[PDB]
Amino acid sequence: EVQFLRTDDEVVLQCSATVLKEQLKLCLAAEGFGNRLCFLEPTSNAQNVPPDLAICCFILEQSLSVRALQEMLANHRTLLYGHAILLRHAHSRMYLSCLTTSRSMTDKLAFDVGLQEDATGEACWWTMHPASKQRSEGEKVRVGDDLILVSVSSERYLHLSTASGELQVDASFMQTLWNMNPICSGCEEGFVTGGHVLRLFHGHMDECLTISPSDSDDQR
Amino acid sequence: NPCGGERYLDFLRFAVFVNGESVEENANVVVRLLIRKPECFGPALRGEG
Amino acid sequence: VDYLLRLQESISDFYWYYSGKDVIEEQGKRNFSKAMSVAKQVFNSLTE
Amino acid sequence: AIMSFYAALIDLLGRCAPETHLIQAGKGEALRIRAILRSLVPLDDLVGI
Secondary structure, three states: OOOEOEOOOEEEEEEEEEOOOOEEEEEEEEOOOOOOEEEEEEOOOOOOOOOOHHHOOEEEEEEEOHHHHHHHHHOOOEOEOOOEEEEEEOOOOOEEEEOOOOOOOOOOOOEEEEEEOOOOOOOOEEEEEEOOOOOOOOOEOEOOOEEEEEEOOOOOEEEEEOOOOOOEEEEEOOOOOEEEEEEEOOOOOOOOOOOOOOOOEOOOOOOEOOOOOOOOOOOO | OHHHHHHHHHHHHHHHEEOOEEOHHHHHHHHHHHHHOHHHHOOOOOOOO | OHHHHHHHHHHHHHHHHHHOOOOOOHHHHHHHHHHHHHHHHHHHHHHO | OHHHHHHHHHHHHHHHOOOHHHHHHOOHHHHHHHHHHHHHOOHHHHHHO
């Protein structure tokens, strides 16, 4: 059976761009602390240069229907097309939202996309829609599907802007197809998994593998 | 085609605005459809250029 | 089955609409009765 | 014709604008629609026209 995305799953929002007649895969990323705006980390050249995947991981905290979201705002579940999802940055724990500020010189109607400290408001919620009619509203979102995200607050698609030389992500009225590639679904207790930060101890010697202190003469 | 655009905009105005007050349902639907099809706003309001 | 799924989604949406309100008015009750009668007929069809 | 089309479009959007009583009641849909209209039409452009 095809894998179905579920809440509490780490995912990376991925888009494809053609630069110099070459397909380039980019993942939505954000630092969170010191920079709330989202950029795009290329991942096609992974064999030669590792991507900074630490900041590209988002957790599907919660998925709701539109009416349920309206009621909740007024006051594991499989993702279904048409529902509203709440993406929380794994590192900073700030929620992906459609910012009111805009810095896109090319597009006047576009808005910046960035992280938000709190989940309050309708800016943090995004609605998934099928990219093609092969899927229909109410169908479970299969892993590897192409979907378009529409901001609830601004009614703007999550867009890849190639107008300028740089590739940038913004909320505009032009739609971009996004792939929600799973990173992890559920880790059984006590087992190591990729993307975990850990210390490598020398057996049980209490010795750990480490680089030299800061300002060392070996340049660390 | 500004002339046809104006005619259809006039019809949409009559559809949304009634007796000096806006009809909320029709206004919301019309706004959503217009934003979904940005070319309705005309070349000037088109975002990219 | 597809029509039943559509009807279930509509009923769930309508429940979400009325969840906040303390009491369902007569029009809401009537729409509930119509939707649930249609759902009962569909369930009987599947059973047969 | 171009000016007539743009005037008709702005008129239609203004009509689609939510009502003041809804805005005071703070209805989410009304505030969202007003924000969308404000984003579409800058105030400086209206003042200059």
